[PDB]
Symmetry: C2
Subunit: 254 residues, 2 copies
């Protein structure tokens, strides 16, 4: 078994002795299990990871997103270049399952990424509040010049592979709770965003060249710190369907 | 009687009344108006006798007996020597109502506002009402010479109307027992702000001789602090309330 060095009690772990290039299905299974346990894993010293290897590794988890700048003749490998808590693309009915990011160059310090644990954010709530959120759904939307999209998702979702409940609201894309009036929804979401990202549920990763970060976009939010040029390669695994309880109330009608 | 309501929410001014020698039949109508309007205002009751006042108040229940009129501890004196509150909710048996007459004061300033706790509750969406029905709160007071506390349902049923009404107020409610203190604070903040919106309140302007009778079971009152003129008033406090509601749906937080 690999050597694991966790970041925080909540989530994140650095995995050592991994060579993603010609990795075996057996070693990959151990990584899928560590991802489920730790929610976000960091594999350092992966400089020189080939395009074909990056593809097949992402392809192990599911379907990749294809285009946004990409490596020549590899639209599944995105080019990240150059500050709010968010869960990737939740304004869509089927948000991504997870992502694989590799910082290929940059400064030794500055540009840290933080991740939060939505299992603990849900568990941390008291029982009357956890019951209330189980029967609620929220609309997630984005309205920029080249995109007007939205999607309803339960406030509390179950991880399909863990069977554990997680909060499914994020400051960036969550618009409003459907079954509550806009005012009640504002007040409740304001508390939930503050709560869900309290230090106890997060981890902060300092990037090093060659570092790979693979995370679960079902049970985490992430935040890129604006404390500092940086380039990275990102593969996006799609296929999420945030499922939860049947809402116990009709949509709020004004 | 001539009845002139202040707002759609609560409050009505009654004309053509003489409290001094009121009949049981006219009082039956006042009692009906108090249950319909929550706070009623009776003007031109100057020189109302002390024994008549005590016989009138005794029609609702037992009177409280400190500054009082000579030979009458049942009649408290308020000689003015700024927060939404329901009277003595920190006690296990808060009062059901009060009868206050303004003997002498300025023409403007010192207006008192009242709010409808029935509307405060109804105005919440279905999921919020469900939550509050199964919750209770500790109401406390901590000053030199008076250290009392009591737990009351967040939503209570008025024993005469059968109607549910919110039972939390900024001045005396400390926290909701079944939630942690942070969730409790956040929820109460929305609640105090909401329960007192203009739509649920009324503002009465006092004139020497005006009498206000109110239902402390389903109202909050506020004393506007905007005048430097001395104002004397005479209060008769009716005791006997036991705020009842639904048994908590969860245990107290740990
Ligand atoms: Fe992202
Ligand atoms: Fe008062």
């Amino acid at each position: 078994a690999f050597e694991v060095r966790p970041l925080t009690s909540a989530l994140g772990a650095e995995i050592h002795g991994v060579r993603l290039e010609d990795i075996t299905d057996a070693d990959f299974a151990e990584l899928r299990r560590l991802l489920l346990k730790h929610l976000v894993i960091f594999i350092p010293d992966q400089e020189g990871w080939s395009a074909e290897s990056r593809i097949a590794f992402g392809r192990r988890f599911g379907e990749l997103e294809e285009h946004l700048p990409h490596l020549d003749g590899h639209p599944q490998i995105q080019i990240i270049d150059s500050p709010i808590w968010h869960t990737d693309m939740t304004y869509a009915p089927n948000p991504p399952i997870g992502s694989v990011l590799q910082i290929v160059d940059g400064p030794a310090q500055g540009g840290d990424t933080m991740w939060s644990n939505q299992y603990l954010a849900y568990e941390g709530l008291s029982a009357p509040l956890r019951d209330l959120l189980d029967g609620l759904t929220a609309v997630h939307s984005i309205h920029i010049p080249g995109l007007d999209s939205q999607a309803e998702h339960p406030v509390v979702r179950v991880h399909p592979e863990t069977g554990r409940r997680a909060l499914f609201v994020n400051r960036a894309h969550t618009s409003h709770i459907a079954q509550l009036n806009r005012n009640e929804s504002d007040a409740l979401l304001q508390y939930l965003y503050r709560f869900s990202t309290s230090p106890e549920f997060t981890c902060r990763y300092q990037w090093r060249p060659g570092s790979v970060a693979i995370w679960d976009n079902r049970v985490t939010q992430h935040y890129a710190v604006d404390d500092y040029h940086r380039r990275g390669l990102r593969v996006v695994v799609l296929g999420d369907t945030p499922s939860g309880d049947k809402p116990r109330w009709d949509h709020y009608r004004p």
